[PDB]
Ligand SMILES: Nc1ncnc2c1ncn2[C@@H]1O[C@H](COP(=O)(O)O)[C@@H](O)[C@H]1O
């Protein structure tokens with residue numbers, strides 16, 4: 240039964256559920272808020288099959304809102320803060336949203352959205368101009384309903400990834416396997432609209448406490464870990480580096496930390512290495528996709544082998560991984576090919592688009608869109624996203640391999656390598672490179688470094704020094720923006 244997930248989370252909630260800016264929130268108080276928000280969403284006439292789009296910041300009420308939406312047998316649709324109004328609006332429509340719930344603090348964006356798409360019901364967590372306040376019940380208990388098709392979440396890329404309640408329950412099990420037994424004091428500075436939100440549920444479910452920050456500032460995270468004696472934190476890779484390289488870090492007390500988790504985007508091995516030294520044996524990397532959820536983790540002990548700094552780790556329990564050719568046949572250990580995944584955590588499919596779902600799923604296996612290989616010890620190494628491979632006359636140049644080499648140089652902090660088409664080379668390799676502090680390395684040294692380590696075909700023809708590598712909304716390297724610089 241689909242309602243089993245929301246109950247699992249609800250059943251877990253301990254003494255203190257959330258801490259943040261304004262102090263603490265007891266389990267009691269959080270439970271209450273779920274019941275309340277649940278009743279209110281039910282009353283507003285939102286039916287089970289349909290989606291509840293949610294626009295909010297990282298607030299404790301937003302944790303309750305998700306859980307309520309899911310308990311009343313609807314699918315949660317977290318509108319990403321960094322997404323454009325046009326992308327967000329497409330999401331509300333395509334997810335079959337019966338409602339837009341929003342926080343007063345983002346009424347501007349709510350208004351903007353409503354001028355672009357129409358939604359039966361419009362509610363808000365507090366008094367607002369453009370919507371009906373929901374925070375306005377007896378000894379009323381939480382009254383669950385079942386989603387017709389068992390969907391807990393729909394989350395967008397522009398496809399809507401539909402995740403089952405079963406899958407989200409499996410993620411709790413995964414979380415425990417990666418992060419330890421509870422309770423956790425888990426610091427979440429990433430948006431609750433996506434993975435942050437699932438981490439919060441995993442945290443509650445295991446009887447721990449969520450610690451919220453609105454955005455990421457290195458000092459803030461450092462104070463928070465010490466003040467709240469946090470055990471866990473999830474950072475984007477860039478944030479890891481900022482935190483590890485911060486001057487206060489050795490002055491600070493982070494003895495509470497059992498896990499500093501990072502992932503979501505490819506990591507810079509040398510910068511990771513540095514973090515593993517500066518922070519303790521607490522570093523853990525996580526690899527997932529929107530479609531696959533969790534796939535693999537690299538443990539703190541894995542981080543103490545330099546060989547493994549180019550890896551994502553061993554697959555998690557119940558996660559089967561296969562490396563495959565263009566044909567579709569299984570390759571041996573050490574071979575490079577497409578990463579395919581079978582697991583309990585994989586998507587059900589792309590919402591109301593089986594055309595696209597079918598080019599991605601095949602026999603229970605999910606094509607992640609990544610390319611990689613396994614080592615002697617069974618750690619997966621990603622050589623590239625499929626889009627990002629550079630082909631030259633029947634040879635694959637994996638852009639991430641070139642970046643690793645470039646970035647090993649002491650004067651290079653970051654690198655994005657792309658192809659542009661060339662009649663005489665097939666594609667010509669190009670590198671945007673971010674230089675250290677106030678260094679001035681020699682393009683030719685970098686070219687040479689690449690040539691010594693990989694070979695002639697890998698050596699970037701052009702090398703542009705840039706102040707930073709542009710990111711996507713999601714915070715991944717925008718290698719399409721970079722491709723354009725060199726055309
Ligand atoms: N730990 C990691 N190392 C390398 N790439 C990663 C990691 N975690 C996530 N990713 C990338 O994020 C991609 C998908 O992100 P998304 O488009 O948001 O699903 C994956 O296909 C990976 O290439």
Ligand SMILES: CC(=O)c1nc(C(=O)O)cc2c1[nH]c1ccccc12
Nearest residue numbers: 434502503525526527528529532533
């Ligand atoms: C494990 C991880 O870092 C991760 N990454 C992504 C990504 O999009 O890059 C997505 C997910 C990740 N973990 C998840 C768990 C449940 C659902 C989705 C995800």
